[PDB]
Design an enzyme around this catalytic site. Structure first.
Site, PDB file in Angstrom:
ATOM      1  N   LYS B 219       0.553  -1.016   0.055  1.00 34.02           N
ATOM      2  CA  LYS B 219       0.157   0.178  -0.184  1.00 34.02           C
ATOM      3  C   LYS B 219       1.069   1.299   0.091  1.00 34.02           C
ATOM      4  O   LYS B 219       2.006   0.959   0.751  1.00 34.02           O
ATOM      5  CB  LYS B 219      -0.877   0.316   1.540  1.00 34.02           C
ATOM      6  CG  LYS B 219      -1.999  -0.793   0.711  1.00 34.02           C
ATOM      7  CD  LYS B 219      -3.254  -0.974   1.233  1.00 34.02           C
ATOM      8  CE  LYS B 219      -4.473  -1.649   0.984  1.00 34.02           C
ATOM      9  NZ  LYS B 219      -4.818  -2.775   1.579  1.00 34.02           N
ATOM     10  N   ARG B 253      -3.692 -10.283   3.580  1.00 33.98           N
ATOM     11  CA  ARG B 253      -4.253 -10.510   2.769  1.00 33.98           C
ATOM     12  C   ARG B 253      -2.611 -10.422   2.336  1.00 33.98           C
ATOM     13  O   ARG B 253      -2.634  -8.883   2.203  1.00 33.98           O
ATOM     14  CB  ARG B 253      -5.423  -9.666   2.734  1.00 33.98           C
ATOM     15  CG  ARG B 253      -5.491 -10.258   1.076  1.00 33.98           C
ATOM     16  CD  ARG B 253      -6.930  -9.391   0.382  1.00 33.98           C
ATOM     17  NE  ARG B 253      -7.232  -8.825  -0.381  1.00 33.98           N
ATOM     18  CZ  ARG B 253      -6.185  -8.264  -1.911  1.00 33.98           C
ATOM     19  NH1 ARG B 253      -6.109  -7.278  -1.306  1.00 33.98           N
ATOM     20  NH2 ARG B 253      -7.000  -8.342  -3.017  1.00 33.98           N
TER      21      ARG B 253
END
Lengths: 273, 273
Positions: B219, B253
């Site tokens: 991210k 994840r």
């Protein structure tokens, strides 16, 4: 949290701003010399420069008598190999240098050659004079937890008591509180499961009120958990580094400086260091 | 800690034994088809097999309408691409499959095609019918924290209230408590600093009493802390994974399955999972 900075001669290490990265430099001895040879020393210098460029704040230098090899070698022989490395690295790389030794004479000669910090795997118990050396030069000393036996009544309680016995040896010799650093000695005098228990409870070491250094890099207990050889423990080491920072350690002693620096920087930002 | 296992049709996931690794599979669309083409589907199958071999416990499959691309595409078009992938992967790889969608019709067709879990980035708020779909097939659903605005009174308190509104939508539709999983939605409706604050306080999510999945892989907030591009965030991601496990998450994840599996396994052993 810390109301002082670690004073290392020409260098000053802030204990509050970031986790401090100590890069491991092990000697690679040249086959036809006692020490100080170009190839051997050039290797050391080049590796110290690479570690500097990838984020190291301290370069830790170890001769043949220390980990991982524990060669039986006299003090005179150890000084011939170690002193030239410290001289070249200290001149060519602008970072504090730590000497990884439990021998008082090695530490003294190392400091004279340009080292800033003493890193002792026996925590002044093998040769108590190392604490007199440390007090005289006014340098930081790392006291690692270590033991001859492995019968613990209560692992964490016993580690703290043993570290306290080290701190008393240091203080009695005149070492100042601001020059003491502690290390839980993961991988020494501990079974794999005791290594895991110490990691789980590392925050307990904070009660003694000294900065803590964690040294777990590439250790066999990682291979034991993962079933992976020494060159495949980067991820296992990273996990120990992250947990250690989370549990409040101020330094980590690592081989893989590039990768561990990134992991430490991310941890620092998340915990709000 | 968990008095039940996650039931996924033919598969059962134990929540107590180890951190569960969810490998991310994103579609790579073929240039001259609407979906189901050999090259496209073969790519998916091969990547799912690689993730399986390196430690994944769940394969998460996303079409074009979901992250990272958020393409505007109709339900009919999304089903043409996603359904063939689920059919082939579910037949050829023996792991539970998660469908990453906020659309109720996509989820229904996906479950019919062989998916086991619904992974919803809008937490049943975009299309409340997805919770009716979930209740009918009796499948686990992941409700992620998400928002249209970014004005938080108190970030963590507001996240918990928002997640609670999701859980109420799910329960009202007949979703059982044992089929609910929560995700803090790092990287959604949060500034870089709010992403860091959520990581720091993740353990607060445990009070709601559901398993938590963490999805931080690659991210932008990692790039922001480290100043590194998307292909250089492996170490930054590892740090978030370690902290997340330390703070009690049951799933992560991740894109980099091999590396994150090793890091998770080491963490599990140290925390005593």
């Amino acid at each position: 949290k810390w109301d002082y900075d670690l004073r290392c001669g020409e260098y000053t290490l802030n204990l509050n701003e970031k986790t401090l990265i100590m890069g491991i430099l092990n000697v690679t001895p040249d086959s036809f010399s006692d020490g100080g040879s170009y190839n051997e020393v050039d290797a050391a210098v080049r590796h110290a420069k690479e570690m500097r460029d990838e984020g190291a704040h301290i370069i830790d230098i170890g001769g043949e008598s220390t980990r991982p090899g524990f060669a039986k070698v006299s003090v005179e022989e150890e000084i011939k190999r170690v002193v030239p490395m410290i001289q070249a690295v200290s001149k060519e790389v602008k970072l504090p240098i730590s000497i990884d030794t439990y021998k008082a004479e090695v530490a003294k000669q190392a400091i004279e050659a340009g080292a800033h910090i003493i890193n002792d795997i026996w925590g002044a118990k093998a040769e108590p004079k190392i604490a007199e050396v440390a007090a005289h030069y006014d340098v930081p000393i790392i006291l690692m937890h270590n033991r001859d036996n492995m019968n613990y009544r209560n692992l964490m309680a016993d580690m703290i008591a043993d570290l306290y016995d080290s701190i008393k040896i240091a203080k009695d010799a005149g070492v100042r509180d601001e020059n003491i650093i502690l290390d839980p000695g993961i991988g020494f005098a501990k079974t794999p499961e005791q290594n895991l228990e110490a990691m789980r409870n590392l925050e307990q070491l904070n009660v003694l009120g000294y900065p803590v250094l964690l040294g777990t890099s590439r250790k066999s207990f990682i291979g034991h958990v993962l079933d992976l050889p020494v060159e495949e423990r980067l991820e296992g080491t990273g996990a120990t580094v992250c947990l250690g920072i989370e549990k409040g350690c101020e330094f980590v002693r690592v081989h893989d400086v590039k990768e561990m620096s990134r992991m430490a920087k991310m941890m620092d930002a998340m915990i709000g260091k």
